[PDB]
Structure 1
Amino acid sequence: SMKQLEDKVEELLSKNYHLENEVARLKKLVSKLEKQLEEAQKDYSEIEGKLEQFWHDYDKLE
């Protein structure tokens, strides 16, 4: 029964290990995502400023 508990802590140890590998994977993916989203936001803001500027310039020729 002591052998049983040692078996149990080993079982839990390896399940714990795999969970924490998955948690690290998912956290690295959250960070990659948040960087990508920041990048997409700056991009959108840039191309919106561009479109607005070309139309502003165009309007200026009246």
Structure 2
Amino acid sequence: RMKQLEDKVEELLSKTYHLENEVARLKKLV
């Protein structure tokens, strides 16, 4: 369960960076 957890945190970290990029771009467009 420790590895399971660390991999989900890893995924969340890439997901939030991805969403951050998507929102920043949207703000640029309007």
Q: TM-score range by the shorter chain?
A: 0.7 to 0.9
- Percent identity over the alignment is 97
What residue ranges of structure 2 are gaps of 5+ in the alignment?
A: none
CA-based RMSD: 0.5
Instruction: Flag the structure with larger Rg.
Output: 1
- C-alpha displacement of 1:26: 0.2
Q: Which residue of structure 1 aligns with residue 27 of structure 2?
A: 27
Structure 1: give runs of 5+ residues left out of the alignment. 31-62
TM-score by length of 1: 0.45
**Deviation for aligned residue 1:8:** 0.4
TM-score normalised by structure 2 residue count: 0.83
